[PDB]
Amino acid sequence: MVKEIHVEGFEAYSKAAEENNGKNIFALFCGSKDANGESWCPDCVTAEPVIARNLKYAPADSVFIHCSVGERAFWKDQSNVFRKDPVLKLKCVPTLLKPGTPQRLEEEQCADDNLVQMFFQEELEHH
């Protein structure tokens, strides 16, 4: 099974990634949840169940960090750390990423079972 972590914001994400430095790290970046547990980001609401039922394809000794990037106002700021971070370089939420690899899925791709399986298996090709 995957070690699952849920954090709010870039600093909490950074701490989880550094504390799991040895492991195969997969990350999801999504809009923060309201008090009903729903992302402000419809594409994130859509992707959550597809990701949860594909987590089983992640390899042994894997960590999955679910990072809430903040509220919509914060996200829409093109200067925000997630977008400007030279490793993450987020274009959008949701993004599934294995940080430091081209293993990346964006937007509708995060709700695609075959793509999310390939992601967790590091089988996406970038021709």
Side-chain angles (χ1 to χ4, degrees):
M1 281 177 189
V2 192
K3 187 183 191 173
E4 306 176 41
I5 297 168
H6 300 247
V7 294
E8 181 76 46
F10 178 76
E11 292 303 340
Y13 166 77
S14 295
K15 175 179 176 177
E18 63 187 22
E19 288 174 333
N20 287 280
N21 196 40
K23 321 184 62 161
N24 229 43
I25 296 157
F26 299 84
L28 175 66
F29 300 95
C30 270
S32 305
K33 281 167 192 201
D34 64 21
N36 303 320
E38 224 83 319
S39 186
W40 54 258
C41 157
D43 293 343
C44 296
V45 170
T46 302
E48 286 288 359
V50 183
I51 295 172
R53 74 195 183 220
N54 283 278
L55 221 31
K56 58 187 31 172
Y57 291 102
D61 197 34
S62 286
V63 183
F64 172 65
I65 305 168
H66 189 287
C67 171
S68 297
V69 295
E71 301 306 336
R72 195 165 200 218
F74 173 89
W75 173 253
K76 284 287 113 60
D77 184 336
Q78 299 281 147
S79 76
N80 86 55
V81 192
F82 288 99
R83 292 177 179 281
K84 290 297 229 73
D85 181 78
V87 170
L88 262 28
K89 294 262 90 207
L90 295 195
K91 297 288 186 256
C92 54
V93 289
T95 297
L96 279 161
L97 174 61
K98 180 159 188 234
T101 79
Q103 294 311 298
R104 178 182 309 242
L105 296 174
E106 289 170 329
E107 289 167 340
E108 67 292 350
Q109 294 178 322
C110 298
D112 185 298
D113 281 83
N114 279 335
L115 292 187
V116 172
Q117 170 170 10
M118 290 178 61
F119 166 77
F120 278 123
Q121 293 178 346
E122 303 178 65
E123 283 183 19
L124 300 167
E125 319 195 63
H126 301 94
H127 59 81

